[PDB]
Design a protein around this nucleic acid. Structure first.
Lengths: 225, 125, 109, 216, 53, 128, 51
RNA sequence: GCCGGCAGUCGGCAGAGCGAGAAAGAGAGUGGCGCGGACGCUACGCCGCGACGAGUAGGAGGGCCGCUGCGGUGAGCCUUG
RNA sequence: CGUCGGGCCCGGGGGGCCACGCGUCCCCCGCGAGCGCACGGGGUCGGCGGCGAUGUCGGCUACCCACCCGACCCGUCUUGA
């Protein structure tokens, strides 16, 4: 009776092992394509910049379709129109971070709240220090840290996202499944800026740090994290 | 039955004693003396008890009969164990496991019989 | 047969203006007055040597009247030779402006 | 049956192999290396034969017990730890031992032991210091070296030799080891001038001398 | 919009193509090449202040 | 040596000083027992800096380190010999404690009985 | 579970992404190779200075 | 707060699991020597994650906080106090 | 004409690859096992040194004193003590 029942336990253990190894090969190779895809977009913008300068023209790049919004002002004394947007972007604490894609609904939400936030377009590396070091997942309405690839694959795995690089490529390259990817990530609990801020109250144009940090946000991200 | 009478005894028994942040129960045949559903010497059909012998040498082990209830004069049977302190534990171990007699108190009865044997010996040098 | 410790002054506790944190102490080793040259004293053992009335034991010698509170230098403080030290027990606050011994035997260079 | 070869890939970075596993497949040559497919002892008693039992069940049990603890993975004991050395501390250099009873004495370094304690020996004639152990942290390493490479350090002395047993009397082996080392190292320091007097002097801080300022 | 969507829902039903059916907000401006025909972009200058009143 | 506990963790307490009622130092009719200040302008109630501290839930000890002596046992009041045998399965983490109303005649009998069962008594020589 | 930083912990990084092994294996040979070529390139300048 | 978990301590009447990316079974059949296994579960109990913790008037809940007397209960204590 | 362009860098005549088996047809050009090291599901040492029966060890609280910082007297009326 147990002679063939022994084969039941060992074969099913073997079936999961090859199944785990088959998925392990998929994680490795999709990331290899993504490294080629990240080298694809970085180099092809250098391709387009030089050729317009070869002739007497200019290559206007597209404004990136994702920005990183950081609330830099506290919750005391906040206008209700301002307060509603901050809880609609999941920015309830000071120095909280979230990913927001760019469309006419988004900037018009962002252009009413710039004294209370500091937002800008992040770099490719700047995503990595957020997803890996501060990446927390909203699983069953619980802030669960991303310590294994199985966590993402069960809430977005039937969407095509099952690992870090599947999540990062869905974040960095704003694809057509982006909405639940930002919903999966908890708003980032960024630490206080090491080295200090210039001025919290005023906009970035006159030497403050509020408003659109369109390029220099990558300097500030390394101070938060 | 067993679950029915546990909900009555659990809070208004004469053996219940709380007394500054613990809970105990001092009825006979209750090894580990906890006021718990598993560790109760009266509500069960099968009951295992360990209690030191009357002469101060050995352990008398008390079993419930399971054949006739409501007759406490003949419901419990006592057997005396007085051996070389290794077969003393082995005899009680065989009364539980080999007889399939309410086995969750197998090891806890051995624990109680182990501590009794250090009471019936010289203690201080 | 000489001195094996550096001269160090207990200048006060870690504080702001209206608050004072007693668990961290500010030290002035005479000789160092710059930020880039406080790296030598980082992690060095610091001891506040005093004496009392009753007799206490002493390792490797006869019981005498001197007692200490052992400590350790945590990190630098405000680019002036000021440096922070943490003791096992907080200072009695009667040693402000009194010289304590910071040692070298927790050395690395 | 097979002689155990060493690791083929060199250590590029700790935890990183230089070759990939696909290249390692060629190196290990697995392409052509595929495969497919007590307690009771009988003793005679002068009755019959008795079957005794080893590791018999205990005669006593305590009232309550701790459960087992969770399994840590990197928590190696002291004997298996890796032992490092400073770049300044090289065999032959002059050291400054502080925390010992030989306070501030200038004492000559010989070699590192298995436990990590430094075999350090300033000549008994000069420093009155025997074959003695010190810790790396509690030593100032002066930048003064000697050509100590051509010496024959005895092999019998080790961590077990300098370990405290339990009045302490100097053994004859300790004196013999001291003379054997002294015959080796003392003529060498005599060749370089002013170092034997340097050893006899004691290190001490004075007024206007700050350890972060001067160099050693 | 419903009438136009239902026309495009019956159409391409025999084709199966997922045509974008929902309305979308204004996207980024789809990076493009801008040219100038030989001439250089003429320099602009802030005006000096003169009291008009 | 004595009867050691089964496990001896590091007992840590967030606050060891007692909680003093407001203005009990100035007056005698105000006892050391804590009373919550329920005034409209009280320095203690609205937590002014440099005042006395109010008892809160954050001052509670760890659930693992609660209710042991510095020796590491939990107390349990004992009246007579019959209540001593209940601790026969808890002698490694619980100690017996004799009441104030136990006479010296039968107090000695409880002490030597507790030695036989190896149960620690925090007051082994009280009345003598 | 204690959350270890994948940026500082190598095999926590490898649990979440096995491509980081070669991505750390690369940018090591390349940095070592470009270090060897630049040193001998300065040696070519040393050969030009000597001649 | 979790559609939270724990009746599975199912032991020579036994085979010790259901953290695991994917809607469902470690399911029944029929032709070609050595007696052994730590804790537990006052299920008004035990254990595991996540978030949060200010407060007047005011409201609710828990008191193994306290006083007095009564019905039971502790083969309770007490002139050796 | 240009691109260290894009198509597994279309196809033909010195360095890195989580690519490794055998047989048949068509199109195109599910159990191999054995040990070890460890950036791997939260600390261990399989490391030690001293001072102690007539003056010392520990006592966070608890009695007093000394120092630094903070600190206006409680209840009530009140927008405001």
């Amino acid at each position: 009776n147990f002679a063939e029942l022994k084969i039941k336990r060992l074969r099913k253990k073997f079936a999961q092992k090859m199944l785990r190894k088959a998925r392990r090969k998929l994680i490795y190779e999709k990331a290899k394509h993504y490294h080629k895809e990240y080298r694809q977009m970085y180099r092809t913008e250098i391709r387009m910049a030089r050729m317009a300068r070869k002739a007497g023209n200019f290559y206007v790049p597209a404004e990136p379709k994702l920005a990183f919004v950081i609330r830099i002002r506290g919750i005391n004394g906040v206008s209700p129109k301002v307060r509603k947007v901050l809880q609609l972007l999941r920015l309830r604490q000071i120095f909280n971070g979230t990913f927001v894609k760019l469309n006419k609904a988004s900037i018009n939400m962002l252009r009413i709240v710039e004294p209370y936030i500091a937002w800008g377009y992040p770099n490719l590396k700047s995503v990595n220090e957020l997803i890996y070091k501060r990446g927390y997942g909203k699983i069953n309405k619980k802030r669960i840290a991303l310590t294994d690839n199985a966590l993402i694959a069960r809430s977005l795995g039937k969407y095509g996202i099952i690992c870090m690089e599947d999540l990062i490529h869905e974040i960095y390259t704003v694809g057509k499944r982006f909405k639940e990817a930002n919903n999966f990530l908890w708003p980032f609990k960024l630490s206080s800026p090491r080295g200090g801020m210039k001025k919290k109250t005023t906009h970035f144009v006159e030497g403050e740090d509020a408003g659109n940090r369109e390029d220099q946000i990558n300097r500030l991200i390394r101070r938060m994290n | 039955s067993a679950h029915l009478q546990w909900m009555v005894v659990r809070n208004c028994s004469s053996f219940l004693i709380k007394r500054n942040k613990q809970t105990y129960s001092t009825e006979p045949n209750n090894l580990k003396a906890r006021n718990s559903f598993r560790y109760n010497g009266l509500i069960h059909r099968k009951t295992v008890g360990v209690e030191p012998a009357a002469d101060g040498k050995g352990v008398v082990v008390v079993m419930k009969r399971r054949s006739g209830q409501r007759k406490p004069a003949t419901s419990y049977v006592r057997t005396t164990i007085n051996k070389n302190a290794r077969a003393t534990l082995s005899s009680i171990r065989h009364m539980i496991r080999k007889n399939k007699y309410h086995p969750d108190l197998r090891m806890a009865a051995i624990r109680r019989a182990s501590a009794i044997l250090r009471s019936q010996k010289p203690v201080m040098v | 047969s000489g001195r094996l410790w550096c001269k160090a002054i207990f200048a006060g506790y870690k504080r702001g203006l209206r608050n004072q944190r007693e668990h961290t102490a500010l030290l002035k080793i005479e000789g160092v007055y710059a930020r880039d040259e406080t790296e030598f004293y980082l992690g060095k053992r610091c001891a506040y040597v005093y004496k009392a009335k009753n007799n206490t034991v002493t390792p490797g010698g006869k019981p005498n009247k001197t007692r200490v509170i052992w400590g350790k230098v945590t990190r630098a403080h405000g680019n002036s030779g000021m440096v922070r030290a943490k003791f096992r027990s907080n200072l009695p606050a009667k040693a402000i402006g009194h010289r304590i011994r910071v040692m070298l035997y927790p050395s690395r260079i | 049956k097979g002689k155990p070869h060493c690791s083929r890939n060199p250590v590029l970075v700790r935890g990183i192999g230089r070759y990939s596993r696909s290249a390692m497949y060629s190196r290990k040559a697995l392409y052509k290396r595929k495969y497919a497919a007590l307690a009771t002892v009988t003793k005679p008693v002068g009755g019959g034969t008795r079957v005794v039992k080893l590791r018999k069940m205990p005669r006593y049990y305590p009232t309550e017990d701790v459960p087992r603890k969770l399994l840590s993975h990197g928590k190696k004991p002291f004997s298996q730890h890796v032992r490092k050395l400073r770049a300044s501390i090289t065999p032959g250099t002059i050291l400054i031992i502080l925390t010992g009873r030989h306070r501030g004495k200038r004492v000559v370094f010989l070699k590192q032991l298995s436990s990590g304690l430094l075999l350090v020996t300033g000549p008994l004639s000069l420093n009155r210091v025997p074959l003695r152990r010190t810790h790396q942290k509690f030593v100032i390493a002066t930048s003064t070296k000697i050509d100590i490479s051509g010496v024959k350090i005895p092999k019998h002395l080790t961590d077990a030799y300098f370990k405290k047993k339990k009045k302490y009397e100097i053994t004859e082996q300790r004196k013999v080891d001291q003379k054997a080392v002294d015959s080796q190292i003392l003529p060498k320091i005599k060749a370089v001038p002013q170092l034997q007097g340097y050893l006899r002097s004691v290190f001490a801080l004075t007024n206007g001398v700050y350890p972060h300022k001067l160099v050693f | 919009r419903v009438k136009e969507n239902d026309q495009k829902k019956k159409e391409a039903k025999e084709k199966g193509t997922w045509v974008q059916l929902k309305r979308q907000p204004a996207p980024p401006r789809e990076a493009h090449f801008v040219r100038t025909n030989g001439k250089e972009p003429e320099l602009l200058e802030p005006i000096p202040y003169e009291f008009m009143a | 040596a004595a009867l050691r506990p089964l496990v001896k963790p590091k007992i840590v307490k967030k606050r060891t000083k007692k909680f003093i009622r407001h203005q009990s130092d100035r007056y005698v009719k105000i006892k050391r027992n804590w009373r919550k200040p329920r005034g409209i302008d009280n320095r203690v109630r609205r937590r002014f800096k440099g005042q006395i501290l109010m008892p809160n839930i954050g001052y509670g000890s760890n659930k693992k380190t609660k209710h042991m002596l510095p020796s590491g046992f939990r107390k349990f009041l004992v009246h007579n010999v019959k209540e001593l045998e209940v601790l026969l399965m808890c002698n490694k983490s619980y100690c017996a404690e004799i009441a104030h109303n136990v006479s010296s005649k039968n107090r000695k009998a409880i002490v030597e009985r507790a030695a036989q069962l190896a149960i620690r008594v925090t007051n082994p020589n009280a009345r003598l | 579970v204690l959350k270890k930083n994948p940026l500082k912990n190598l095999r926590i990084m490898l649990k979440l992404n096995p491509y980081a092994k070669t991505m750390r294996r690369n940018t090591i040979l390349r940095q070592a190779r470009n270090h060897k070529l630049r040193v001998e390139r300065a040696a070519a300048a040393l050969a030009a200075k000597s001649d």
